[PDB]
Amino acid sequence: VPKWIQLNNEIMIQKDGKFQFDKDKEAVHSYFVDYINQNTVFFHNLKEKLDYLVENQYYEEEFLSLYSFEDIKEVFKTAYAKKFRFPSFMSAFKFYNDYALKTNDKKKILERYEDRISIVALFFANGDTEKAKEYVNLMINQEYQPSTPTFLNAGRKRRGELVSCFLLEVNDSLNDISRAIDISMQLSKLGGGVSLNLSKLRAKGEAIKDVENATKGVVGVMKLLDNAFRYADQMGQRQGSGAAYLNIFHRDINDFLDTKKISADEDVRVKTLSIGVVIPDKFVELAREDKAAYVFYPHTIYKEYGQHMDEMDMNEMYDKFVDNPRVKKEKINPRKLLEKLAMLRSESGYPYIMFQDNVNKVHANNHISKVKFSNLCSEVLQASQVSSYTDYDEEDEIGLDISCNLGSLNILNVMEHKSIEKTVKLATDSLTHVSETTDIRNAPAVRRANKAMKSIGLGAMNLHGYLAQNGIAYESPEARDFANTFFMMVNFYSIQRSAEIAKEKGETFDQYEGSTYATGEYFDKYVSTDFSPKYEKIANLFEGMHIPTTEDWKKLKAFVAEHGMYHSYRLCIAPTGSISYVQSSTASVMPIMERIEERTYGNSKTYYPMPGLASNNWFFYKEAYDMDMFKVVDMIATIQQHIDQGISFTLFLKDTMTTRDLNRIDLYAHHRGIKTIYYARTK
Amino acid sequence: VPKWIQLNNEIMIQKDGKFQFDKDKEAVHSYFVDYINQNTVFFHNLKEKLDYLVENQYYEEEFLSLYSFEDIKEVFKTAYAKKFRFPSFMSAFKFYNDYALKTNDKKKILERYEDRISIVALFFANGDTEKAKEYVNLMINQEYQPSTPTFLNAGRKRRGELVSCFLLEVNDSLNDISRAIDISMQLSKLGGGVSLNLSKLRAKGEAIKDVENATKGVVGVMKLLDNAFRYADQMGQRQGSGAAYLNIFHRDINDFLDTKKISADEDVRVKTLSIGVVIPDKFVELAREDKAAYVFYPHTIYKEYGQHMDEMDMNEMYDKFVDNPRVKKEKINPRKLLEKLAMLRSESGYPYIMFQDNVNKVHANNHISKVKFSNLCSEVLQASQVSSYTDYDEEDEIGLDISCNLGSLNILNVMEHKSIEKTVKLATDSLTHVSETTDIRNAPAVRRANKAMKSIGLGAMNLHGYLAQNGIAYESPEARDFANTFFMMVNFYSIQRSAEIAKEKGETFDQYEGSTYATGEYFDKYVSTDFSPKYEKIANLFEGMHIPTTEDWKKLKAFVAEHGMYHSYRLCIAPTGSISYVQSSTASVMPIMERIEERTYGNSKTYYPMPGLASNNWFFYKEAYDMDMFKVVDMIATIQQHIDQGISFTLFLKDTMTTRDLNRIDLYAHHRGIKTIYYARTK
Amino acid sequence: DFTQMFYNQNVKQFWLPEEIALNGDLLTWKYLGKNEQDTYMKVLAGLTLLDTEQGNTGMPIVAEHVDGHQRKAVLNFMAMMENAVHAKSYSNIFMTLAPTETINEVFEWVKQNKYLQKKAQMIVGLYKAIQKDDEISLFKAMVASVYLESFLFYSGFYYPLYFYGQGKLMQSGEIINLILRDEAIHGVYVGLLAQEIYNKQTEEKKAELREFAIDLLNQLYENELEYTEDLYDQVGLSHDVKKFIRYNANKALMNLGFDPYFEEEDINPIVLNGLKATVEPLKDDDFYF
Amino acid sequence: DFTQMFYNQNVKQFWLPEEIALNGDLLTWKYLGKNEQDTYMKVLAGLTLLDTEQGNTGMPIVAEHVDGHQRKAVLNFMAMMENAVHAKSYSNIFMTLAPTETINEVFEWVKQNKYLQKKAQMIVGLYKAIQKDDEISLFKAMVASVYLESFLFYSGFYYPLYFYGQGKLMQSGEIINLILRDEAIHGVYVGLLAQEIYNKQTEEKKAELREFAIDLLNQLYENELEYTEDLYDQVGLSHDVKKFIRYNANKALMNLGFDPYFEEEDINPIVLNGLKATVEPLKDDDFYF
Ligand SMILES: Cc1cn([C@H]2C[C@H](O)[C@@H](COP(=O)(O)OP(=O)(O)OP(=O)(O)O)O2)c(=O)[nH]c1=O
Ligand SMILES: Nc1nc2c(ncn2[C@H]2C[C@H](O)[C@@H](COP(=O)(O)OP(=O)(O)O)O2)c(=O)[nH]1
Ligand SMILES: Nc1nc2c(ncn2[C@H]2C[C@H](O)[C@@H](COP(=O)(O)OP(=O)(O)O)O2)c(=O)[nH]1
Ligand SMILES: [Mg+2]
Ligand SMILES: [Mg+2]
Ligand SMILES: [Mn+2]
Ligand SMILES: [Mn+2]
Ligand SMILES: [Mn+2]
Ligand SMILES: [Mn+2]
Prior knowledge:
The complex is a heterotetramer, with 2 copies of chain A (683 residues) and 2 copies of chain C (289 residues). By secondary structure, chain A is α/β, with parallel strands linked by helices. In chain A, 44% of the residues lie in helices and 11% in strands.
């Protein structure tokens, strides 16, 4: 048993009726002094280390050649000038086991935390020494954390893509289905999660060019995609993860849901394919009034109207579809479908729930397209256009497939540094750089949408950690007040930075002129409502920091009208799974699942108290399962009103909660404006 | 019970100790006058019939527009002047259930046998009235039978392709694997059977861009292809049929064979994918000497030598691969592998066995490529060049993927009419037309190889029927003498027709000048050895029909050298499954399995005596299971020496014989020059 | 001279109640009077009790004391049939035809029925009195077992056979016929083992063993008469069943090598109508031709 | 919670020796060396001798002391498989491969063998020590039974599985695989019955029963190592057999609800080749807030 593992295990040994939280500092100190400093390759000078890394196929010479070695040395000086110390053993362990650069035999350590941060900053700045130093200060202060792909792979020769979330539209054709399988395998090969919209595919028992009842439906494509993701398993390193989305009004919705039942047949069940259900307001209205609903065969609708069923507004088109004799449908019970959804989420956590009209009532790019589905993590909500992949000899009609770049603000560190504006703008610049430097050669729609939309996702994390370390309960109205003010400021400065980038480059995103940013409809609630804190305690948290006012929002609206907006999408709150340990932060804006995290690595068990947990703030670190999910919905809806994309919203349920309770949580989330629901986690 | 199937069941009622074979004539007469003439749509004149069929999307207008209606009327008169009568109930039942045109609701019958034959003939002739009449005479006399795709779809609007056998080479890349899956689904959608070579794919545990043990092997691609063929099943009426081929020296050969074991897990076993094993003479030599053989990792060989393993000569490079330290190899026992092959064929009928050096020592187009795999029916043996499907933005290097049009001579009717030459030439013309009118716009390599190679497959059937109806035992030397003379004559006239077509069109097949036809080496055994029958009984069977001598073969060799050959491949003997009933013929050149064949169609049981079966030739219709497989191998090898492609050779095994007997049959087939072994059928 | 042929016969007779679909009896059951259904349930419950004890106790204990691995294998197989096949089949019948409350009630009824308790007490008492290496106590238990197999079951078997013979409850009846086919061979086999022990005795000892067998039979018989009247009076069949049990008592005696004890009588004719490829390694010479 | 499920799995696994033709094994048997033939014979006799104890004593004694009709039926079925199916199967394999005189000599040798006797008598000793109405002594015997079914057989099963995985002695290997599949379920079932007793005990009594189980495992394991070297050194396999013993010891412990004792090890690949929370409806007013 390692000495640091023993020291970390003494946290649970209760001395004087309290956990020994101070043992984790001893644990991390022992971990470093006994393992990391021993296994860290040291070089006489930074020049020798850099030469070894570039020449041994560890780094990329292209981005490092943009600086004189003096500038790189000063950047590394800035990283090491902070004397950053990991507060807990788990932070250092997670970094040096997941993100630190190791030798080709994975025996020694080439990169410390400072080296990784310096390389990421030098890649972000793209030749600017002052910008690189600013990125170094931002990341070594741990105010901004680039996503796991960006943080892990930036500046590495043998790297995967810096983007890991992709959203593909699948057209109703064998050519398009085969192309979707190919692109899914190519993107999973790069290490990215792939989400596929299956709503355009015609249902089971539909006609294929005069041969009726010949289509296997969305479940055959589901099996194809599941095997494609199983094959493209990231070189046998990490299991290939993909998601499939289907509209709740699709005829195959029940077959779509039956793929996740525990009793599912092996010719129906899918293993590596997550499922998400898209629910328009029409379905919730039908279930509310207990009227019997209809699911429609998409190809009949396409033949009758020339438009896909998911391309049309179900609120206005549902009655026309039902009254159309040439549109094929079967009766369903919407309440029974809702209960089936809740039962499936209780049993397996699936499907994801995307409230279509909650997303699109505040969507800023409805002119480009409505948001029809989400990503594998249920936070990316962007307009997509389906591609028409024709025969081999013909020319394909390339659409827009969603792929956004992820980054997370550390709410605790941004708040303690009083640097919401600077951190938000620098994170926007880094995400923009990642977007520009991303070129995917086997997903033409993804590449086209990356070049045109220039969409980024700037998330946040350590919300519960910041609140509990400041004596604020997560469910308290003061917590929602802080979230309101903080994310209003984040949105303000992200919009300002996007407009500044548009002014600097003289270009906006494609089809910006039709957006609500161009017409000013986006800024209505910001030029009409004041989002300053309503509590003196919360207003004191923002001391020394200018909270944007209504006049500031009017000035921003005028600036955006004059100069445009560079990013179609800017903010999305991803789960931030493994980077939260490195940042000593609670995951995303979700509340903590456990106060102290018990995990086993190898044959030794490890203990991870939540960051900042102590005796004084023990009960402010309320576990998510002990919380009222209605108040968590209230918090996420408070945040969601300032996030242009969605938020990964996990439901934390007790074992005593019934199907009716899960349905009530889902319906209250729909009522409160929640766009997506990620997971149903039961204790 | 239907009257016709009641009459057909009176065959088995033994009267005076004999089967009532004449009941089948009464059975078919009742079948017609009680079902067919009643359910047949009859028009006032042929003009109304043709207008009705063209207008209601049953026929194609383009091919019928090349003839004035007087010519079409003359063709239909020629078809009906024969007054063809089906000799058995099964012939008419199979035709009117599988190939006769029916109304859109599958209610009535639009085409008789004469109508279908006339339409196929007018399609073949392509505007020529006299040629259409010649084709009508050829098919109404049942001397030549177009394959099921051609006979079923010739001249129909809503039709599949006229070719159903496709062979695909898969390169060792994810782009090429995705393209292989796409092309397999596209061709299965067209109704064709697709065979894929998986030898170029690197084995399990190979590196994918310097990360080791990353490749899932050929079994992952096998699962992908199996699900692709399950998806593209054409309503499931005829589910997607695929074949995978692996060289026996591939490292994944044991896992490739384990996909067919009964005890295989659901994560390994493939169900819709047939498997074939390509065995070079090196493997048979290694097993014969009981030496230690080695299977190789294909990617190591490709990296070391720059060529794929299956693109190299194993009999000359096996020792170099073994001695090469940079080539990765695994030790196997070749005799244990042979025993495993025999056990797998006993328990499942798989794998197909291709003797690669038996194919390539007589292959005429080794300059283009060596034959590396066979088709799903294990009789197409043509040169293929792998394609290089690149990224979306890059141009693809299109290779040569095999596909040939099938057609069978009826040996009994051809020999009765003394029309080997005319039947062979007309069948060659029809197959050439089918090749020219085929355009696969989603399989680039299939299209390119169809345009370049112009390969056709002209098979034969009713060999056992003809021999049994002429008092010749299938195993007798006289039967092999007849097969030798008959198929030498067929080869002579097919080569003559190919040379005449090349002379008329002024073009040969691509890379003809490097072929053995151009060098004249192909004709060595024909200008040196006389193939006239050695028995007076057989010599009288060919009386009235000129048998080409050595002088005739020398003249043909000069003609080919001076004019070239239009088809790279001309003759392949396919199984000819369902068209054998319509033609009242035994299936292919293989011996019959049952003298009287009992089948259940729906809830009706009907019996099919072999064509011409009686008491005077009961024992000449010896079942395939009761005869020596060594003599059947001798017969197939006698036929194979005149066939440029392979012969679908089914092994008929008793329950008593062990795996050693199956291995002995396989080794004797390899010794006797058998190119492929199709099935190990056990009774 | 006989165990091997009994072994082969027993294993070739192997069956499970699930092989017989029972939903076909649903209508002929529905159509019976309440009296008929009551007697039928109770009859099968009495059979279930007998097989429960024959499987749990009787056959295993006799197996323990009989010498020879093959004899033990036959007796072990018979024991398995009693409780894993026969006793369970009755529950399959009950679960098809009757609601849970009626099933619960009939099992409560077996516990409190004095004739069924008396016959179980007597038979199981003799099983549990067997002493190791004491052939006389073993003989007495084997007589008890033959009387259970070949006599005591028959007051129960009568009624399913009576219906089967009229074309009623034929699926349940098929199960019962399979059970009866098994018990007939079980009674013969145990009878032969009992005769082995009897034949070792002096004439004086034999005379005492016959007294034991006849006294036991009469005691069981008198109890079975009361049981039969209790069950069958409500369906009008008691006298007919009594003739049947006397018939089968004679068969039990014969299985024990004794003369018939009751006079022959005409039995209801309805009830009579109720009755891989081998792997061979390749040789070197296989590669040359 | 489990007896009916195990009943189903047991009866659906029913098989008979006659189903596998054995004669084709002579085509690979003739090609084995003397040491291979010797080891195989000795292993086979070891399995035969241990399985006979389980059929004559182990299963019937547990069936006798366990309460519950359905459990007694399952246990009877398992005892039947030992005596009627497994024992005949082992005999059939022997009679096929060796002449009568060779069989008699191998059994004489294995009967005198120190390591086979040590384990056979240790197990039998615990079966003989069961006392009426004493669940502690029953538990100890169940532990012994699980150790036999799930652990002690496997030093023996190794060799037939090793041949079976190589394509040698396939007919007898198929038989052994069916036997092994029965012993696996026997071990799991008896394990659940032992856990039931264990869970009825105090914490101190539990700790005492754990110590008993581990101590017994240790004694048997140390003897298995000696048994293994004695049989397998002559064919060079002992190292790999030892890994297989430990892996199966861990399975036996898990059957008894205990933690694995030995570190995880990979097994010889040739031998490997041989081997709802609560639904509640939405009642309206849940759509309004
Ligand atoms: C991407 C991928 C490839 N493979 C296998 C299948 C292909 O035959 C083989 C080649 O993959 P490639 O697509 O050629 O990968 P690569 O070009 O980046 O690697 P290399 O430089 O070695 O050519 O790898 C997998 O098994 N799983 C996978 O996820
Ligand atoms: N010497 C050295 N410095 C390293 C290494 N990895 C990162 N660094 C950082 C530490 C300093 O901030 C910076 C410059 O180190 P140096 O080259 O030793 O500089 P100097 O102090 O000699 O001027 O590089 C490393 O491996 N060696
Ligand atoms: N009348 C008619 N003829 C058919 C039909 N299908 C095929 N035929 C064939 C039969 C003859 O050989 C040929 C000409 O038939 P027709 O048009 O009736 O001509 P004719 O009998 O007046 O010369 O067409 C059909 O449906 N009707
Ligand atoms: Mg289409
Ligand atoms: Mg490649
Ligand atoms: Mn019984
Ligand atoms: Mn009995
Ligand atoms: Mn056993
Ligand atoms: Mn057992």
